[PDB]
Design a protein around this motif. Structure first.
Motif, PDB file in Angstrom:
ATOM      1  N   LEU A  77      12.565  28.417 -23.173  1.00 43.25           N
ATOM      2  CA  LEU A  77      11.754  27.280 -22.739  1.00 43.25           C
ATOM      3  C   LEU A  77      10.543  27.754 -21.933  1.00 43.25           C
ATOM      4  O   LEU A  77      10.664  28.001 -20.729  1.00 43.25           O
ATOM      5  CB  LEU A  77      12.586  26.319 -21.873  1.00 43.25           C
ATOM      6  N   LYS A  78       9.381  27.880 -22.578  1.00 38.96           N
ATOM      7  CA  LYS A  78       8.193  28.321 -21.864  1.00 38.96           C
ATOM      8  C   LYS A  78       7.054  27.324 -21.946  1.00 38.96           C
ATOM      9  O   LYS A  78       6.574  27.019 -23.022  1.00 38.96           O
ATOM     10  CB  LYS A  78       7.734  29.669 -22.398  1.00 38.96           C
ATOM     11  N   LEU A  79       6.638  26.818 -20.793  1.00 37.36           N
ATOM     12  CA  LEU A  79       5.551  25.856 -20.700  1.00 37.36           C
ATOM     13  C   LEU A  79       4.794  26.057 -19.402  1.00 37.36           C
ATOM     14  O   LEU A  79       5.223  26.814 -18.530  1.00 37.36           O
ATOM     15  CB  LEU A  79       6.086  24.428 -20.753  1.00 37.36           C
ATOM     16  N   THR A  80       3.664  25.377 -19.271  1.00 34.75           N
ATOM     17  CA  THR A  80       2.854  25.497 -18.073  1.00 34.75           C
ATOM     18  C   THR A  80       2.505  24.128 -17.588  1.00 34.75           C
ATOM     19  O   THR A  80       2.294  23.228 -18.389  1.00 34.75           O
ATOM     20  CB  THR A  80       1.546  26.184 -18.343  1.00 34.75           C
ATOM     21  N   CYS A  81       2.398  23.975 -16.281  1.00 34.78           N
ATOM     22  CA  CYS A  81       2.082  22.676 -15.747  1.00 34.78           C
ATOM     23  C   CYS A  81       0.784  22.666 -14.987  1.00 34.78           C
ATOM     24  O   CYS A  81       0.307  23.713 -14.569  1.00 34.78           O
ATOM     25  CB  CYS A  81       3.221  22.227 -14.863  1.00 34.78           C
ATOM     26  N   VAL A  82       0.216  21.478 -14.811  1.00 37.19           N
ATOM     27  CA  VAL A  82      -1.043  21.317 -14.096  1.00 37.19           C
ATOM     28  C   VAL A  82      -0.988  20.049 -13.263  1.00 37.19           C
ATOM     29  O   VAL A  82      -1.306  18.968 -13.765  1.00 37.19           O
ATOM     30  CB  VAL A  82      -2.208  21.170 -15.068  1.00 37.19           C
ATOM     31  N   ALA A  83      -0.606  20.170 -11.999  1.00 35.40           N
ATOM     32  CA  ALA A  83      -0.508  18.994 -11.143  1.00 35.40           C
ATOM     33  C   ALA A  83      -1.848  18.540 -10.613  1.00 35.40           C
ATOM     34  O   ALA A  83      -2.664  19.360 -10.205  1.00 35.40           O
ATOM     35  CB  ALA A  83       0.410  19.275  -9.993  1.00 35.40           C
ATOM     36  N   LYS A  84      -2.075  17.234 -10.613  1.00 39.78           N
ATOM     37  CA  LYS A  84      -3.331  16.719 -10.101  1.00 39.78           C
ATOM     38  C   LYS A  84      -3.017  15.631  -9.092  1.00 39.78           C
ATOM     39  O   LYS A  84      -1.842  15.314  -8.879  1.00 39.78           O
ATOM     40  CB  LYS A  84      -4.195  16.158 -11.226  1.00 39.78           C
ATOM     41  N   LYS A  85      -4.063  15.069  -8.477  1.00 42.03           N
ATOM     42  CA  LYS A  85      -3.917  14.021  -7.464  1.00 42.03           C
ATOM     43  C   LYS A  85      -3.252  12.794  -8.062  1.00 42.03           C
ATOM     44  O   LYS A  85      -2.167  12.911  -8.601  1.00 42.03           O
ATOM     45  CB  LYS A  85      -5.278  13.651  -6.903  1.00 42.03           C
ATOM     46  N   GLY A  86      -3.872  11.619  -7.956  1.00 41.08           N
ATOM     47  CA  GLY A  86      -3.291  10.419  -8.564  1.00 41.08           C
ATOM     48  C   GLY A  86      -2.354   9.537  -7.749  1.00 41.08           C
ATOM     49  O   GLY A  86      -1.534  10.021  -6.969  1.00 41.08           O
TER      50      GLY A  86
ATOM     51  N   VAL B 224       0.832  -1.191   0.000  1.00 42.96           N
ATOM     52  CA  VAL B 224       0.000   0.000   0.000  1.00 42.96           C
ATOM     53  C   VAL B 224       0.872   1.248   0.000  1.00 42.96           C
ATOM     54  O   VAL B 224       0.545   2.257  -0.643  1.00 42.96           O
ATOM     55  CB  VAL B 224      -0.920   0.034   1.226  1.00 42.96           C
ATOM     56  N   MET B 225       1.990   1.162   0.720  1.00 43.90           N
ATOM     57  CA  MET B 225       2.934   2.274   0.822  1.00 43.90           C
ATOM     58  C   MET B 225       3.516   2.622  -0.535  1.00 43.90           C
ATOM     59  O   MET B 225       3.537   3.788  -0.956  1.00 43.90           O
ATOM     60  CB  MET B 225       4.060   1.923   1.804  1.00 43.90           C
ATOM     61  N   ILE B 226       3.960   1.588  -1.228  1.00 39.63           N
ATOM     62  CA  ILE B 226       4.555   1.764  -2.525  1.00 39.63           C
ATOM     63  C   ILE B 226       3.583   2.263  -3.552  1.00 39.63           C
ATOM     64  O   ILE B 226       3.899   3.205  -4.267  1.00 39.63           O
ATOM     65  CB  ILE B 226       5.106   0.462  -3.068  1.00 39.63           C
ATOM     66  N   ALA B 227       2.387   1.667  -3.587  1.00 41.46           N
ATOM     67  CA  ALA B 227       1.393   1.974  -4.627  1.00 41.46           C
ATOM     68  C   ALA B 227       0.167   2.882  -4.521  1.00 41.46           C
ATOM     69  O   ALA B 227      -0.056   3.727  -5.397  1.00 41.46           O
ATOM     70  CB  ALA B 227       0.915   0.662  -5.211  1.00 41.46           C
ATOM     71  N   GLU B 228      -0.642   2.709  -3.486  1.00 37.57           N
ATOM     72  CA  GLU B 228      -1.888   3.464  -3.418  1.00 37.57           C
ATOM     73  C   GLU B 228      -2.001   4.724  -2.557  1.00 37.57           C
ATOM     74  O   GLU B 228      -3.092   5.174  -2.231  1.00 37.57           O
ATOM     75  CB  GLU B 228      -3.013   2.461  -3.091  1.00 37.57           C
ATOM     76  N   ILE B 229      -0.883   5.320  -2.202  1.00 37.59           N
ATOM     77  CA  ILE B 229      -0.979   6.520  -1.407  1.00 37.59           C
ATOM     78  C   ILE B 229      -1.094   7.711  -2.339  1.00 37.59           C
ATOM     79  O   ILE B 229      -0.290   7.875  -3.252  1.00 37.59           O
ATOM     80  CB  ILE B 229       0.246   6.669  -0.496  1.00 37.59           C
ATOM     81  N   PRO B 230      -2.116   8.547  -2.129  1.00 36.81           N
ATOM     82  CA  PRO B 230      -2.390   9.754  -2.923  1.00 36.81           C
ATOM     83  C   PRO B 230      -1.194  10.676  -2.882  1.00 36.81           C
ATOM     84  O   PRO B 230      -0.419  10.653  -1.946  1.00 36.81           O
ATOM     85  CB  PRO B 230      -3.583  10.378  -2.215  1.00 36.81           C
ATOM     86  N   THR B 231      -1.052  11.508  -3.890  1.00 41.53           N
ATOM     87  CA  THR B 231       0.076  12.427  -3.943  1.00 41.53           C
ATOM     88  C   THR B 231      -0.175  13.327  -5.129  1.00 41.53           C
ATOM     89  O   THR B 231      -1.054  13.049  -5.945  1.00 41.53           O
ATOM     90  CB  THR B 231       1.406  11.664  -4.150  1.00 41.53           C
ATOM     91  N   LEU B 232       0.577  14.409  -5.234  1.00 41.84           N
ATOM     92  CA  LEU B 232       0.381  15.301  -6.353  1.00 41.84           C
ATOM     93  C   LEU B 232       1.637  15.323  -7.211  1.00 41.84           C
ATOM     94  O   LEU B 232       2.733  15.036  -6.730  1.00 41.84           O
ATOM     95  CB  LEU B 232       0.014  16.692  -5.831  1.00 41.84           C
ATOM     96  N   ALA B 233       1.457  15.626  -8.492  1.00 40.40           N
ATOM     97  CA  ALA B 233       2.560  15.692  -9.448  1.00 40.40           C
ATOM     98  C   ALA B 233       2.086  16.391 -10.701  1.00 40.40           C
ATOM     99  O   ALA B 233       0.886  16.423 -10.985  1.00 40.40           O
ATOM    100  CB  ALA B 233       3.040  14.298  -9.807  1.00 40.40           C
ATOM    101  N   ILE B 234       3.023  16.963 -11.441  1.00 35.39           N
ATOM    102  CA  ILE B 234       2.654  17.615 -12.675  1.00 35.39           C
ATOM    103  C   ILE B 234       2.107  16.493 -13.541  1.00 35.39           C
ATOM    104  O   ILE B 234       2.658  15.393 -13.501  1.00 35.39           O
ATOM    105  CB  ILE B 234       3.868  18.194 -13.359  1.00 35.39           C
ATOM    106  N   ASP B 235       1.048  16.752 -14.315  1.00 35.36           N
ATOM    107  CA  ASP B 235       0.452  15.703 -15.168  1.00 35.36           C
ATOM    108  C   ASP B 235      -0.071  16.205 -16.502  1.00 35.36           C
ATOM    109  O   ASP B 235      -0.776  15.495 -17.220  1.00 35.36           O
ATOM    110  CB  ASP B 235      -0.691  14.982 -14.435  1.00 35.36           C
TER     111      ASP B 235
END
Ligand SMILES: [Mg+2]
Ligand SMILES: [Zn+2]
Ligand SMILES: [Zn+2]
Lengths: 46, 181, 147, 115, 65, 391, 266, 136, 56, 30
Positions: free
Chosen positions: G151-160, G34-45
């Motif tokens: 280098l110009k870009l924008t990010c949008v981090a979501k849960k997952g 569970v630690m390795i896989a199913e813990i919620p977290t945020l990241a650019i996506d």
RNA sequence: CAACCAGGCUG
DNA sequence: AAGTAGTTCTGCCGGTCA
DNA sequence: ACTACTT
């Protein structure tokens, strides 16, 4: 790219003598690198 | 290598000497004593197949020279320097090989054919053929995202530039049956 | 493929949680089958691994050059010098239950090449399509949607 | 290309239920529950616990085939005892034990010093 | 070819340590074997990572537009 | 497509990902391997067309082949190598797991069978649960070597009413052998029942093996300290055994064996010495390998590797050859230019003394190549030559 | 306290060596996983690219951006874009970062994880901060550029979570061991001469009594006491990657009851 | 609804573990008829056995005063368990070591056994049924 | 020899194969993308009119 | 002792020299 | 909707 | 007796031309 | 090569 630059072709005829690895080949042509089947041993690499 | 027994201070012996060598690494480190110099100084010479017929070669310079007056149980089992007529010596045997085979680790431990296989496949692999791909318009071409130089190496690779333009990755591999897939 | 004519294709993929593991944490990136070693007689693969496990630990560019004075015996000593099993093996746990694996596994790195030839450039299917002109039979070539 | 969507590993698709219980006809008083969008993590555990209720004659579970996130769980119990319940308990137990493990881990932690 | 962020094998961040490692070598004049140990790269999965990367990007940058 | 079996009728099962997935036991009939092989699929079009496939050429039918009045598919690789270990008297399985093995078998009558061991800890034996896969009415009797209705070595094979009574289960029992557990189930219960047996046997063993694990690595290729030293002398002695005959012929004291030159007859002895040597050099290592040795375990079950395999890895590679004669004199009166003329000793006609674990010498290596290069060649010949014949 | 107990051995900001004792292996493992896989977290996506002249191709960069750890303390109060009601995304379900870099320097200019710039209202909550543990505090060298490289870009981090893709995993390696002196006989050591001699003892042999000949074989002997060590990347405090582990797993085991309920109505 | 089918103690002539980390084939003679020989493999892990030993052996078809196997539960149930090793298996052959010395073979899911003598004329049924038990 | 004794045909498919220890002997795993290209002409019958209309 | 023998390792320095001058593709060029 | 030549995989 | 042409395995997948 | 029919 390197290996292709050191490639040898030895036109055929109609045996197995030329296809085989000769002694005199030591130090000159590679003992392990040659195309499987078809033109095996006919194409050598320095 | 020319071995002419011109050693009025011992047996037969290689023309080139530790001096010649440190004198070369001298010039290596400057990045005057070229290959051509080792040549003109008649220390090493070019012998073809025909001329090879009439000479006698020593594999390892050392091993096959000084006299004999224990042996490692792990190492292989070498024949011997049973001769004195040694006219020449091989720079290193690892050079019978070709670019291809030269990247195969421990090919002196594989069933002969297996070496001819990897000798063809390495030409089916991916990497970074040149560093200017960004600028080339060649039809079709693949560059591996993150290329790692190999952990296992060959002194030959060094000249094939393999470490600067690898073609694979060191994968943490486990040999085992699992799911069965 | 490895550098020993050890070609092979993936068959499935798993995430760390399903992958077997060594108490130390490390998990595999690849899992090849023990059967492709005996009959192939490609010990080199085996050695490159023991040597690389070491070189990776010590950070010293392992030498697997042609004919050298190196040996499995020597290499096994340096790896014992680092705490791991002398031959490579390690104890591992079946990621599903977490229970130990009754066997030990030959672990450690190994240079692996990814050669051109990925399924999705091949996988091809056709049910009626372009037909040749002289013949009127289906055309030749996946690119041209032949049969 | 023929790749399934990564999230399908855990999002119950339109019209599927985590559980689905079918009465095993082979033996008496025993059932087979299909857990959709789940895996070993959950399975192995509910199997273990389930393996204590001494009123549980049989318990085992298997993941049909890797490609699919799901597993079947067969639970057989003593007469008059319905397995659905047996599953319930074993579930609770796990929760209760975990909760403890939580309080406790937090206990030890709070009583620590980092560096 | 730019450092890998995180270790293929265990996920442990590694994108930062590139520069540190490169100085714990050229400057601090240390050996790789430990320069890595220093950057906290304990087990080999993460090691093989840094110890092996070939920062080609540099040769790349060195072109033009 | 060489024979009927290279084309079989299968049941579709649409799945994801880009590849045709087929069962393993049907791998051998096509000659299929997964190092990147491709296979074609044809889809019937008429109602009667399909009938032709389902009734006439479905895998289940193709099982016991007339090419050799014996079955042509059996248990292999993992399942094979694993089905042996599951069997060994030595191996026992505990309830929590036995309850899984049971479930995993899609037929299982939901009847936990009585542990062979009740006493302290209720235990089950590999043979036991494995037999939950073998249907009833299946009878089989073997008798390998020291077989004795009490086979101490756990030999042969005695299965009754579809239950393993004694003797390990490996290639000779559950393979594509003549007496086959398969050959029998097929004949006895139908192409149908058998077809599903591959299934069960697999899903059971495969699963057990998933957890019991198995592997291989250098450690398995090293010959015991003395048993190796002992081999180095088995080599050496034969070296002299040859050195002698060598002078014995340099002195002109040899009876040209009827019909052969002195030389002809000479090499003949030489050879039979070196090879003979190596074979023992091998056998030596082969028995010095305990049962825990993986490379041996595979050889036992019969999933991979054989004698000479172990031999050339741990013992001695052997005498390389070309066109029959050992390496010849391409260079005037010598093999390489690293030798002196007129040398006939083993270290020159191509005798690789080293083991693959040790590592061939520059000569050993190059002679070995000349040798391989020969196979690779005719392999490209016999292949096409065959093809035409076949046609 | 009451059921399965703990006893933290060493402990830091990045690891939490500790002894999970009096538990079921199943459970030790369940959590392990569970630690390795199913813990919620945020990241650019999601990465919208306006301009790039780097040598690294668009997606190449985009890929990395997903691995650059991000802040996830309060992740449990940010919704999954998929459950939120916005036509796509909002501050209620995501964080938005920025990245603009120009080769001004006469010598290779550097783009770092620190150069990110949250632009969405963080509605007052610890989330979306390019986690830095770098010595100079620049963390994760995104990429480099030459002269006039932009280098110009924008990010949008979501849960997952990790099952959706690894970049959401917080764990990253976890040490798991048990019964250091093969007392349950859960393995069979391979050896040439001596098992004990060739196979290294573990730092955990200490914390458990050695075998000692004579004694028969303890068969009723089960297995409690597991020497785990939960590392972390940062997105979440090593302690959490164990509490939330403990919790997440708990909720799953939960939903199964809840399921058995609605299913009870009919 | 049953009872025993053979009883007597023997002494371990010798115990052998030929390549068997956890099992040994043993053999002992009867402390009565010098007719009754015995061969029995044993899980010498869940019940060790050292040569020269007084072991009571039994047979019979039950354990109380079959079908799906149930877990313990029997915390309190009948239990002909009055021993410290109780296997179960099947009888495959009934050999006739000539004369009037009959022998039967029993296999316990792999583990074999051989008996001798000639008094279990109406006892040692040829049936599958057969729990084996040993004490001391 | 190349047109009559053997020819290219419609309704055929081809990809890389990989073993699966999870399919019955006689099955064959087919990639969706393929199951979706390859077709089977089926006649409308009261026996399937419904089934088929759903597919259509 | 700019006149002593030369062991294995040494040969490499020579080989290095070789390529420094000739180059992997020499032949095609010359 | 084509030929011809050439080259590369099936290990 | 020398010499010539057919057949020499299966299938899949970049450059010039009337 | 290997085999028929030609030169
Ligand atoms: Mg293939
Ligand atoms: Zn790592
Ligand atoms: Zn929203």
């Amino acid at each position: 790219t390197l290996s292709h630059l050191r490639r040898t072709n030895t036109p055929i005829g109609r045996l197995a003598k030329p296809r085989q690895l000769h002694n005199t080949h030591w130090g000159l042509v590679c003992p392990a690198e040659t195309p499987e089947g078809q033109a095996c041993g006919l194409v050598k690499n320095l | 290598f020319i071995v002419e027994d011109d050693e009025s201070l011992g047996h037969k012996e290689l023309k080139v000497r530790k001096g010649h060598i440190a004198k070369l690494m001298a010039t290596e480190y400057q990045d005057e004593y070229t290959w051509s110099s080792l040549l003109n100084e008649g220390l090493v010479e070019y012998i073809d197949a025909e001329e090879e017929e009439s000479i006698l070669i020593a594999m390892q310079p050392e091993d096959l020279e000084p006299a004999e007056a224990d042996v490692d149980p792990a190492k292989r089992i070498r024949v011997s320097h049973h001769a004195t007529t040694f006219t020449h010596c091989e720079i290193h045997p690892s050079m019978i090989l070709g670019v291809a085979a030269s990247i195969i680790p421990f090919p002196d431990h594989n069933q002969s054919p297996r070496n001819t296989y990897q000798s063809a496949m390495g030409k089916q692999a991916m990497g970074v053929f040149l560093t200017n791909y960004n600028v080339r318009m060649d039809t079709m071409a693949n560059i591996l995202y993150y290329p790692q130089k190999p952990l296992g190496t060959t002194r030959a690779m060094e000249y094939l530039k393999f470490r600067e333009l690898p073609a694979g990755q060191n994968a943490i591999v486990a040999i085992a049956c699992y799911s069965g897939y | 493929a490895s550098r020993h004519g050890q070609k092979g294709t993936i068959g499935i993929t798993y995430r760390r949680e399903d992958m077997p593991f060594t108490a130390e944490g490390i998990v595999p990136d690849l899992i090849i089958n023990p059967h492709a070693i005996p009959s192939r007689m490609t010990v080199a693969h085996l050695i490159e691994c023991l040597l690389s496990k070491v070189a990776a630990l010590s950070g010293n560019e392992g030498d697997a050059s042609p004919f050298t004075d190196i040996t499995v015996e020597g290499i096994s000593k340096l790896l014992r010098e680092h705490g791991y099993q002398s031959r490579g093996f390690e104890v591992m746990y079946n990621g599903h239950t977490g229970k130990k694996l009754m066997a030990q596994i030959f672990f450690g790195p190994t240079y692996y090449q990814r050669l051109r030839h990925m399924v999705d450039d091949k996988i091809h299917a056709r049910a009626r399509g372009p037909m040749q002109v002289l013949t009127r039979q289906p055309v030749e070539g996946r690119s041209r949607d032949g049969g | 290309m023929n790749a399934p969507d990564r999230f399908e590993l855990f999002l119950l698709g339109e019209g599927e239920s985590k559980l689905k219980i079918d009465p095993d006809t082979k033996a008496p008083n025993a059932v087979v529950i299909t857990f959709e969008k789940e895996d070993h993590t959950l399975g192995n555990l509910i199997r273990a616990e389930l393996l204590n209720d001494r009123k549980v004659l049989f318990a085992a579970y298997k993941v049909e085939h890797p490609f699919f996130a799901r597993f079947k769980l067969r639970i057989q119990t003593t007469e008059g005892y319905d397995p659905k319940d047996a599953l319930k308990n074993a579930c609770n137990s796990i929760i209760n034990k975990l909760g403890a493990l939580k309080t406790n881990f937090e206990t030890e932690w709070n009583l620590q010093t980092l560096a | 070819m730019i450092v890998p962020v995180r270790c293929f094998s265990c996920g442990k961040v590694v994108g930062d340590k590139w520069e540190s490692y490169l100085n714990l070598l050229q400057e601090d004049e240390l050996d790789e074997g430990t320069a890595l140990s220093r950057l906290g790269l304990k087990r080999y999965c993460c090691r093989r990572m840094i110890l092996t990367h070939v920062d080609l990007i540099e040769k790349f940058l060195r072109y033009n537009p | 497509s060489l024979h009927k079996m290279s084309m079989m009728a299968h049941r579709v099962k649409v799945i994801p990902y880009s590849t045709f997935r087929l069962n393993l036991s049907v791998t051998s009939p096509y000659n299929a391997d997964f190092d990147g092989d491709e296979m074609n699929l044809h889809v019937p079009q008429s109602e009667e067309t399909r009938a032709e496939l389902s009734q006439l050429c479905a895998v289940p039918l193709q099982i016991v082949s007339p090419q050799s009045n014996k079955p042509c598919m059996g248990i292999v690789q993992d399942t094979l190598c694993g089905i042996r270990k599951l069997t060994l008297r030595d191996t026992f399985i505990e309830l929590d797991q036995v309850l899984n093995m049971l479930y995993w078998v899609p037929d299982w009558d939901g009847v936990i069978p009585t542990p062979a061991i009740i006493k302290p800890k209720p235990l089950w034996s590999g043979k036991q649960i494995l037999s939950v896969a073998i249907p009833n009415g299946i009878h089989l009797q073997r008798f390998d070597e020291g077989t004795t209705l009490l086979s101490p070595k756990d030999n042969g094979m005695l299965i009754i009413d579809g239950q393993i009574i004694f003797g390990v289960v490996e290639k000779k029992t559950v393979g594509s052998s003549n007496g086959g557990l398969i050959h029998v189930v097929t004949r006895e219960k139908g192409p149908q029942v058998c077809a599903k047996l591959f299934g069960n046997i697999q899903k059971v063993v495969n699963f057990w093996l998933l957890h019991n694990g198995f592997s291989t690595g250098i450690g398995d290729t090293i010959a015991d300290g003395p048993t190796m030293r002992e081999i180095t002398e088995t080599i050496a002695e034969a070296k002299k055994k040859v050195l002698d005959v060598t002078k014995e012929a340099q002195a002109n004291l040899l009876t040209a064996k009827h019909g052969m030159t002195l030389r002809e007859s000479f090499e003949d002895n030489v050879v039979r010495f070196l090879n003979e040597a190596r074979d023992k050099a091998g056998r030596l290592a082969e028995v010095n390998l305990k049962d825990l040795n993986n490379v041996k375990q595979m050889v036992m079950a019969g999933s991979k590797g054989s004698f000479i395999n172990i031999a050339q890895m741990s013992a001695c590679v052997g005498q390389q050859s070309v066109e029959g004669k050992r390496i010849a004199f391409g260079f005037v009166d010598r093999t390489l230019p690293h030798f002196s003329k007129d040398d006939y000793s083993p270290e020159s006609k191509g005798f690789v003394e080293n083991s693959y674990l040790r590592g061939l010498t520059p000569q050993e290596f190059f002679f070995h190549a000349m040798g391989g290069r020969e196979g690779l060649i005719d392999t490209a010949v016999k292949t096409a030559e065959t093809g035409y014949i076949q046609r | 306290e009451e059921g399965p107990q703990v006893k933290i051995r060493e402990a830091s900001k990045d690891n939490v060596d500790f002894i999970l004792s009096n538990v079921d292996l199943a459970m030790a493992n369940s959590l392990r996983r569970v630690m390795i896989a199913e813990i919620p977290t945020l990241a650019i996506d999601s990465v919208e690219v306006e301009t790039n002249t780097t040598v690294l191709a668009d997606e190449f960069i985009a890929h990395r951006l997903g691995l650059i750890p991000l802040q996830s303390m309060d992740i449990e109060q940010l919704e999954y874009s998929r459950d939120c009601f916005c036509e796509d995304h909002c501050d209620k379900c995501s964080v938005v970062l920025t990245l603009q870099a120009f080769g001004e320097s006469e010598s290779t200019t550097n783009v770092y994880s620190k150069d990110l710039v949250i632009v969405s209202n963080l509605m007052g909550r610890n989330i979306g901060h390019p986690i830095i543990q770098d010595k100079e505090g620049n963390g994760v060298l995104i990429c480099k550029l030459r002269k006039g490289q932009e280098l110009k870009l924008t990010c949008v981090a979501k849960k997952g979570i990790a099952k959706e893709h690894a970049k959401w995993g917080p764990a990253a390696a976890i040490e798991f061991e048990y019964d250091p002196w093969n007392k349950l006989k859960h393995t069979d050591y391979w050896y040439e001469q001596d098992s004990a001699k060739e196979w290294p003892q573990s730092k955990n042999c200490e914390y458990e009594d050695p075998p000692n000949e004579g004694d028969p074989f303890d068969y009723k002997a089960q297995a409690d006491t597991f020497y785990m060590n939960v590392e972390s990347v940062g997105s979440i405090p090593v302690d959490q990657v164990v509490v939330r582990g403990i919790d997440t797993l708990q909720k799953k085991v939960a939903s199964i009851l809840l399921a058995l309920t609605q299913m009870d109505q009919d | 609804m049953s009872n025993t089918l053979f009883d007597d103690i023997f002494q371990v002539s010798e115990v052998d573990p030929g390549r068997y980390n956890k099992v040994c084939r043993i053999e002992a003679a009867s402390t009565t008829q010098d007719q009754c020989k015995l061969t029995l493999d044993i899980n010498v892990e869940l019940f060790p056995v050292a040569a020269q030993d007084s072991l009571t052996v039994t047979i019979a078809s039950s354990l109380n005063l079959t079908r799906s196997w149930r877990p313990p539960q029997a915390g309190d149930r009948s239990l002909a368990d009055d021993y410290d090793y109780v296997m179960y298996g099947t009888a495959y052959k009934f050999e006739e070591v000539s004369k009037d010395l009959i022998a039967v073979y029993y296999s316990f899911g792999g583990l074999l056994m051989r008996l001798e003598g000639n008094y279990r004329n109406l006892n040692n049924l040829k049936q599958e049924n057969a729990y084996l038990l040993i004490r001391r | 020899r190349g047109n009559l004794m053997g020819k290219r045909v419609d309704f055929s498919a081809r990809t890389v194969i990989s073993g699966d220890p999870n399919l019955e002997l006689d099955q064959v795993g087919v990639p969706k993308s393929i199951a979706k290209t390859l077709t089977y002409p089926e006649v409308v019958t009261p026996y399937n009119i419904d089934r088929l209309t759903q597919l259509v | 002792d700019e006149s002593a023998p030369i062991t294995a390792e040494d040969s490499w320095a020579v080989i290095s020299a070789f390529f420094r001058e000739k180059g992997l593709v020499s032949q095609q060029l010359d």
